[PDB]
From a paper:
One of these, the 4-phenol oxidases/dehydrogenases, catalyzes the oxidation of para-substituted phenolic compounds. A fundamental distinction is that the oxidases efficiently react with oxygen producing hydrogen peroxide whereas the dehydrogenases hardly react with oxygen and typically employ other proteins, such as cytochrome c, as acceptors.
Among the proteins of this unexplored clade, we chose the enzyme from Marinicaulis flavus for experimental evaluation. These features are consistent with molecular oxygen being an inefficient oxidant for the enzyme that is therefore identified as a vanillyl-alcohol dehydrogenase active on the typical substrates of the 4-phenol oxidizing subgroup. Conserved features include the dimeric arrangement, a large chamber at the subunit interface, a constellation of active site Arg and Tyr residues, and the substrate binding mode in front of the flavin si side. Pro151 is located within a sharp loop that covers the flavin edge on the re side of the cofactor ring. Conversely, no tunnels are present in the wild type and the dehydrogenase mutants where the flavin re face remains fully shielded by residue 151 and Trp153.
Numbering used by the authors:
A (entry chain A), B (entry chain B): 2 to 519
Write the structure that this text describes.
């Protein structure tokens, strides 16, 4: 059971837990044996009093949110907002600090608007990708949504954390437009056009007038987000998902070189993802099926996985969108960029001899379909937890191969398999490292923790920095953005002390602490 | 001559001007008769005491900028940052509050980088569209810029003020990525990946890590931007500008209905502008050759203006960009959207009998070429001054024609010709009123001011709010954004006090005043 947070007497807490009970009822304030679904499901720390929520209030309306926050102020008790708390690999529901009261907003799951003609939604935090998909399919509206894989999570929560998907609307927060925010002092505000009485333009024009501030409430503890609009892609006129595989590990250098101009110009219309053999193999197989050793898979077994599954060492999944004459012209350009590489194979779905297969699973994500497979890369090594390192780099052959060499060496030295991805949004490259681990074994937890810290250090040194991370590592990732003795984070703390003078919102989110605890 | 700001002695002001000239050098502080170019070129006020800058100071570098800002805190003297200060329809280089010192960053004009492979540029505030386009050409870089019409101003200032242009990169601040900011306390920060030392990714990935704050320094007085990256469209494989004209003034309703889907699915790849006959005639004609009288042009004349200029009542020019196969597909989808309207005509550039012409002139702008010509809204009625009203609205026929009617009637009622434009970014329609008028005449200035206030009130009362405005009206536009007793401006005022406690940056900007002056 979790301790109190330093500064909060037992009376103050228990008073506040009763005053929270007034505001939302006594059935929607959770303690004790009801608390554990909001623990980190993939624990990394071997000290068991870190990332431990004291309680979990669960309001149903914006107004409750406001009082909660006013009470939180009154008793000096900190809160930790989560839209749905399916933030797996990042801590799930749990706070950075022990003792903070989770503020859960599953209950505020009203899809407030879905406009077909203008291509947007207005949703509250609780709305899941599944819920929003379904409501669209039931009404037969000709709109796609843009989805993580698997499609756990909140439309809102995923976006606020700068999350990403697999269609042209892949940059979730880029597609955001208008939000309502409960400030730390209890007051509510609407950004953009939503600050105009009588507007019909909240989800039509991001800026509004004057300082553009939506972004400060993303990867932030500056407020609580109670509604958010997002743009949604009109159902296109055509769709052709594809896979391009490469034989050799070294091919990732030339592949990244070829990908650059296609991505910088928008020729490839969604995110480009080039995945290593084991990360894609892990969509349909486990390690035990290919190798019995405790260590990482040997060359000879890779060759066997590649022949068996018609994957490469590298595996480029992508999709063409819009009308057929357009899709034909983009294909011509993309295909001719890769054709002259020894060993390259190209595949549309109908060229896939297997009926369970990478491309058929990926095609669902690249058309906005939230799919919940019980078979992914978590199962690879018998099951457990995952963590991901996804730093930014320039889209260059040299930057890719370097990251690959650095990470695969270290990852394999520590006994894990290399599960890597090269991902391009538009002008950004991300070498994403996935490490699966047994989160019940304390010695493996030690290995992972250490390996992680070394990867951050070595990548920072090469100018590569993380954009999204686990609650455990939030302070560490803040420390990488250290230009001029932490000038940026000094400003954030200025803003934090002004909006939240009593430090009751998500203390330590993104490394932002507030004067009382700093 | 101009007065001291209230709360600022001449002892203070005089010692602060010494230090300034100690920092930058005596030759780069301006007073007396050298303030004349920092005056609003297009005056609206009859009160000769308002929007009058006490002095200017022209730093050579970011660090001189910091030095000045520190001096400004310690003597309570306020600063009005301008990049090149060419903000002509919005009060130009002058400040809301008289006595404010102009901080003129035009000497800070380095092109720090232009990168071809990654399509981007890093620029100081003084860099003009013309300097950047010329740099690019000198070096033979296959990049386009995105430019206003005409293109006299600042890549940075325009972008910070939510400027727009005529390519797919038409939304300037959208395309921005990374910036260096001198805060109101004199500390300097870098945003995004720029906060990480050794990064090569400042201009490739907006977010960095944690709260997204670039927006807070646009249309704001929260800091002074000293560096900014912007993304730059790579050279397309083909480019075809077009013009479509509409016979009847009522055509705009159904036209706006047809633009919606084409714009939302991105079939029209740049901003969609639909201009009124009179707006173009008054660039490349005179009033007296069509109608002799003192008042606004009668319906009679319109049919004559139309045949003379080979235009319509509404005139839509856009451009297709891509390999010819893709442009063809788009043209077909766009021509077929409008083919069935009575009176529609279709023009490519070589179909234009006139070589001084809207399409030919716009073909330059929609491929990112900045131009000055011998033309503008003068030599129509001996005007000189102009001001714009550009609120946001849904893309509907009903909304378009409704604002057409609302505005024209009122503009004509006040003696001005109706000069209008319907523009669509992505999901956002603006009906834009250009109001041309005599700067010199105090009788037309008065009427302009009564007319402007009405337009604001009436558009606001239907839920259409402005996104960009003249220094004179900043408070009024701000007060339309009033949901929940001006909650949003109450938050901005909070932030202003934390960052700028002495209130020395640009008091009034976007109606943001801060504690001392409220
Ligand atoms: C196997 C696997 C695959 C994954 N694949 C992807 C993928 O493809 N793409 C991807 O983007 N992610 C991916 N993830 C990460 C994660 O599981 C998803 O992003 C998930 O959909 C997001 O969780 P959520 O929506 O519940 O967010 P939440 O946990 O509800 O919110 C995220 C965080 O943001 C803040 N926050 C959220 N809502 C609010 C609010 N209303 N007000 C204030 N602060 C708030 C909090 O600090 C919160 O902890 C993957 C994870 C795993 C384990
Ligand atoms: C005939 C005519 C046509 C026009 N056409 C267009 C058009 O097509 N598109 C368009 O967008 N505009 C247009 N404009 C408006 C205007 O001329 C342009 O926006 C111009 O490019 C802006 O001048 P600038 O870049 O020098 O801005 P500046 O005056 O330098 O900056 C504008 C404002 O931004 C802020 N600012 C500037 N620099 C900084 C900084 N470093 N830090 C903090 N705040 C800062 C200040 O508040 C300043 O008042 C037109 C105007 C006229 C008169």
């Amino acid at each position: 059971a979790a301790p109190l947070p330093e500064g909060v007497s037992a009376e103050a807490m228990s008073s506040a837990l009763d005053r929270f009970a007034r505001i939302v009822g006594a059935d929607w304030v959770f303690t004790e044996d009801k608390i554990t679904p909001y623990e980190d499901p993939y624990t990394i720390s071997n000290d068991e009093t870190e990332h431990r929520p004291y309680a979990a209030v669960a309001p149903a309306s914006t107004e409750e949110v406001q009082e909660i926050v006013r009470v939180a102020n009154e008793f000096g008790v900190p809160l930790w907002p989560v839209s749905r708390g399916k933030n797996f690999a990042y801590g799930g529901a749990a706070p950075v600090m022990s003792g903070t009261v989770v503020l859960d907003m599953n209950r505020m799951n009203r899809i407030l608007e879905v406009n077909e003609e203008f291509g947007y939604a207005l949703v509250e935090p609780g709305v899941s990708y599944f819920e929003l998909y379904d409501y669209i399919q039931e009404k037969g509206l000709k709109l796609w949504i843009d989805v993580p894989d698997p499609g756990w999570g909140s439309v809102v929560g995923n976006a606020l954390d700068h999350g990403i998907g697999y269609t042209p609307y892949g940059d979730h927060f880029a597609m955001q437009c208008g939000m309502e925010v409960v400030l730390p002092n209890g007051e509510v505000v609407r950004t953009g056009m939503g600050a105009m009485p009588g507007n019909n333009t909240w989800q039509l024009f991001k800026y509004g007038y004057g300082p553009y501030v939506d972004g400060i409430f993303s990867q932030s503890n500056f407020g609580v987000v109670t509604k958010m609009g997002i743009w949604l892609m009109p159902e296109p006129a055509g769709y052709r998902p594809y896979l391009i595989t490469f034989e050799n590990e070294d091919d990732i250098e030339t592949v990244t070189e070829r990908l650059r101009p296609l991505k910088v110009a928008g020729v490839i219309q969604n995110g480009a993802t080039v995945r290593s053999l084991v990360l894609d193999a892990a969509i349909t197989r486990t390690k035990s099926q290919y190798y019995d050793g405790d260590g990482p898979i040997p060359p000879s077994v890779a060759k066997t996985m590649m022949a068996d599954l018609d994957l490469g060492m590298w595996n480029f999944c992508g999709a063409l969108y819009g009308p057929p004459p357009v899709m034909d012209t983009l294909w011509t350009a993309i295909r001719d960029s890769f054709a002259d590489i020894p060993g390259v194979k190209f595949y549309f779905p109908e060229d896939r001899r297997h009926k369970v297969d990478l491309l058929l699973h990926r095609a669902e994500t690249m058309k906005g379909v939230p799919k919940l497979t019980e078979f992914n890369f978590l199962n690879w090594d018998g099951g457990g937890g995952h963590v991901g390192f996804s730093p930014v780099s320039p889209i260059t052959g040299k930057d890719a191969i370097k990251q690959y060499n650095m990470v695969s060496s270290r990852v394999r030295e520590y006994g894990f398999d290399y599960m890597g991805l090269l991902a391009i949004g538009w002008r950004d490259l991300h070498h994403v490292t996935v490490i699966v681990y047994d989160k019940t074994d304390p010695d493996e937890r030690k290995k992972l923790d250490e390996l992680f810290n070394i990867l951050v250090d070595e990548a920072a040194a090469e100018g590569y920095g993380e954009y999204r991370t686990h609650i455990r590592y939030m302070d560490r990732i803040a420390k990488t953005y250290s230009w001029n003795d932490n000038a940026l984070w000094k400003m954030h703390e200025t803003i934090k002390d002004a909006l939240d003078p009593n430090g009751i919102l998500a203390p330590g989110k993104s490394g932002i602490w507030g004067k009382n605890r700093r």
